[PDB]
Amino acid sequence: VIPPDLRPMVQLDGGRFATSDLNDLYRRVINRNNRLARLQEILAPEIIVRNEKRMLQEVDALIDNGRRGRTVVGANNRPLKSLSDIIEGKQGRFRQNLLGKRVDYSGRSVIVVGPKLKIHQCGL
Amino acid sequence: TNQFDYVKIGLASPERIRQWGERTLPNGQVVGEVTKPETINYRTLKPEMDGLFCERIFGPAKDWECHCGKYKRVRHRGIVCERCGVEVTESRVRRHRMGYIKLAAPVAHVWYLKGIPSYI
Amino acid sequence: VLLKALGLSDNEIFDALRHPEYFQKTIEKEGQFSEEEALMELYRKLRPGE
Amino acid sequence: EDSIRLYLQEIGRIRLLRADEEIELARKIADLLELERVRERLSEKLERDPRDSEWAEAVQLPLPAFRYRLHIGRRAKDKMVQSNLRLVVSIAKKYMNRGLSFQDLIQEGSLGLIRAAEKFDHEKGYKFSTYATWWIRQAITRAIADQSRTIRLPVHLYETISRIKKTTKLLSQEMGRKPTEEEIATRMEMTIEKLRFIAKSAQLPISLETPIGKEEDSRLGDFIESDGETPEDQVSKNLLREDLEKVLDSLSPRERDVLRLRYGLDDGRMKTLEEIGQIFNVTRERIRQIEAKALRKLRHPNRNSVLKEYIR
């Protein structure tokens, strides 16, 4: 289970405190795990236990909202970016978050015509 | 740089992932897990017990401060909140600690499963 | 077709009339409706199990 | 491609077996009550349970014979259980998913069912159709909202947030829609501030990984830092902190070496007046004086006059 500070819960004052999208996986997953066990003992019918084991193996969604059950839904029925959906696409961390970090110290201003200066040197 | 050399990779394993995650402590005891869903309580703003953002097993929030409280200043380097699971440092160690849901059932990993290859 | 609604005696040779299935169905098609109209391709493969 | 369908699809045919077996179960309803109830009364006198089968019944009971009481008495409160697993959909529908999942809003309802049987009540005069539900809907709810917003809510709050304005909605009578204003607080006997307190604490967190907008280069949350150090004050403070002692260079080392860092500084912040009293010159006085001496060996503005820009 990944550490908390990094999936973190975020801060916007007002009550709209965004939180995250894998801790809710968990949120699932832990509950499906505990509530279950918390059947075991009472050993009541498997209709509420053996049937949950699937709602337990369902943790597969944690690992991928998306392979193989229908995905679970997000704020907009999105494939809740699975923990296995962070460093996966070109826009998914991974390379873009390392091979192509953005980075600091430099400029980004419109390059208008300015042939007055020489070539070996630019005009800042 | 130097300290690292080359990266092997194999199927991980509980009992092997049972080597990290848990962090026994001189309460003399045994800490790893998590059990119960959580972020912080609403009113206060800090995780709880278990708790997915634990301020104890996971570590600090305000840097060098036991959830038990009575904890300020830093220089300590072993603190274990006498009466809590707060073992402070810098609030950095928190980023370097994992736990586990401890599946009651022996669930299998989707990454073999419907896997394009479906090794399993 | 017509084996789920308006299963009127050969109503197709009354609405189609011109070459509906070479003018007379095919092999594989039978057009039984007694238990197909509102009861086939609806549970006979559709929507299964009950 | 569906386990909900599964529920159908294997229990949509499950019936209620009528309510006649209620008494057939009643015999067992008890009997189990017993069999345990003894066996833990017997836990409870002693041995905290000898883990003995016979003690599984205060009255005598041949092992296999009583093994027939249980299992049979159990399928009684198990078949009927599996049987009473159709109308439950009512609770699902009424509570859709309660910001969770239809299924979780029925499996938590299953936590009911059992919490019926037991304290379903035989020889009552009608089915738990008016009592089973009861649990059901009191067991879901409790969940639901225990469940699901990843911030647990106390009920005194997650209900005020859904009552303070609800009431008002109706309380709007004799007023203009949104009734009064802070009188609402008074109406429910509260202080606005707590009200906002409750108002603020509502809705839910934003995605923080949702598209910035109509366009892309955007899951939200590409999107803040709180704290690093703003390189600026990490190259500052070190200089400052370090200099706080690195400019300690306008005094003799009798104090420069000791009181340098008050009683702590750089330290968590302490080892104090006593200690130095001993720790350095078997003093107790000399701490305060030579410390005051140095405590001024820096202030007349020329002493250590190289960090005046500090103005801090």
From Swiss-Prot, chain B:
Transmembrane segments: none annotated. Zn(2+) binds at C66, C68, C81, C84. It comes from the Bacteria. Belongs to the RNA polymerase beta' chain family. RpoC1 subfamily. In cyanobacteria the RNAP catalytic core is composed of 2 alpha, 1 beta, 1 beta', 1 gamma and 1 omega subunit. When a sigma factor is associated with the core the holoenzyme is formed, which can initiate transcription. DNA-dependent RNA polymerase catalyzes the transcription of DNA into RNA using the four ribonucleoside triphosphates as substrates. This is DNA-directed RNA polymerase subunit gamma. The gene is rpoC1. The chain holds residues 6 to 125 of 625 of the full protein.
Swiss-Prot record, chain C:
DNA-dependent RNA polymerase catalyzes the transcription of DNA into RNA using the four ribonucleoside triphosphates as substrates. Belongs to the RNA polymerase beta chain family. In cyanobacteria the RNAP catalytic core is composed of 2 alpha, 1 beta, 1 beta', 1 gamma and 1 omega subunit. When a sigma factor is associated with the core the holoenzyme is formed, which can initiate transcription. This is DNA-directed RNA polymerase subunit beta. The lineage of its organism: Bacteria, Bacillati, Cyanobacteriota, Cyanophyceae, Nostocales. The chain holds residues 197 to 246 of 1131 of the full protein.
From Swiss-Prot, chain D:
It comes from the Bacteria. It comes from Nostoc sp. (strain PCC 7120 / SAG 25.82 / UTEX 2576). Interacts transiently with the RNA polymerase catalytic core. Residues 273-292 bind DNA. One of its GO terms (molecular function) is sigma factor activity. The keyword Cytoplasm applies. This is RNA polymerase sigma factor SigA. Sigma factors are initiation factors that promote the attachment of RNA polymerase to specific initiation sites and are then released. This sigma factor is the primary sigma factor during exponential growth. Residues 159-234 are annotated as: Sigma-70 factor domain-3.
